[PDB]
Amino acid sequence: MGVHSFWDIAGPTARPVRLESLEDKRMAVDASIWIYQFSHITGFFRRICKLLYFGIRPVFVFDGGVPVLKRETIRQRKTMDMIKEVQELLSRFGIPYITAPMEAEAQCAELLQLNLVDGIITDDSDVFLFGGTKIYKNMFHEKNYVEFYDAESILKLLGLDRKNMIELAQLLGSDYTNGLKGMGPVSSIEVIAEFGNLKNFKDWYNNGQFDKRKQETENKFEKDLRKKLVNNEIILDDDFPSVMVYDAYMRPEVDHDTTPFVWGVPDLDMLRSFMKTQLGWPHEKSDEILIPL
DNA sequence: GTCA
């Protein structure tokens, strides 16, 4: 997920962290993203166990609904009784969960900004756009280490602040915008490097679009860029950059609740029962995995 | 370099 291929750009700044080092950390986890995949009880259970195995204290976050901007965009790119059975599993695991007003990602970012969590576990790079600043990526790949990302390293090493990343999304694409046809990680980062921002990029493109001369006296990088935008027949309007896309990312609907989370030990019997009730499990299988933790 |  995320600004399409934004992870490609943020990429060079990742720093590998052993999962052992995460012991005792309060971590926001976007639950809705998991439900949108996972059978739905099995995946949760495995992932939850990996989490607890390493001593992570997770807070699961759920969507309170999908904003209109996100609905349109996903559709174009092409029971909730499952959500209950999973909050059942969580509660029986002692793990707290909240339902956000709108987006789990944006809410997750707010938990970090309020010191209710230490980091965000996510593979959705839109979390940077909503202002998330301490991201753990590839938590459920089969590895012993995870990739750590923070907004400061991105700032110092790449020269990209939060506004820059929202404008990167309007080139690359994301949960809110399709980006521009023909634009990927490298064209997009270079457009920001050359013009600083999208207004100067639109201006450069409209001012030379029919002025016969400037097009022949342009740098090579420009000459190739103009070509690609024209091949794709792109119209840079007064709608570009989008003010509403900027607004959805900069001020999303979020729950300023400042009440610290509480974590309980799991319950070895409520879980063994649970899995039997639903997944046709024995108390042998259940106990063998859990009891260690 | 950008997409199956």
Numbering used by the authors: 1 to 38, 53 to 92, 768 to 982
List sentences quoted exactly from the publication behind this structure.
We report four structures of the Rad2 catalytic core solved in four different space groups, three of which represent the productive substrate binding mode and reveal that the protein recognizes a single 5′ nucleotide of the single-stranded portion of the DNA and a 3′ phosphate group of the ss/dsDNA junction. The two critical regions for substrate binding are the H2TH module with a Rad2-specific α-helix 12b and the hydrophobic wedge that binds the first base pair of the double-stranded portion of the DNA.
Briefly, complex I comprises a Rad2-ΔSC dimer that interacts with disordered DNA. Although it may represent a functional state of the enzyme, we assume it is rather a non-productive complex. For Sc-Rad2-ΔSC in all 10 independent determinations of the structure we report herein (including the non-catalytic dimer), helix α5 is missing. However, α4 has a similar location in all 10 protein structure determinations from four different space groups, implying that the conformation we observed is stable.
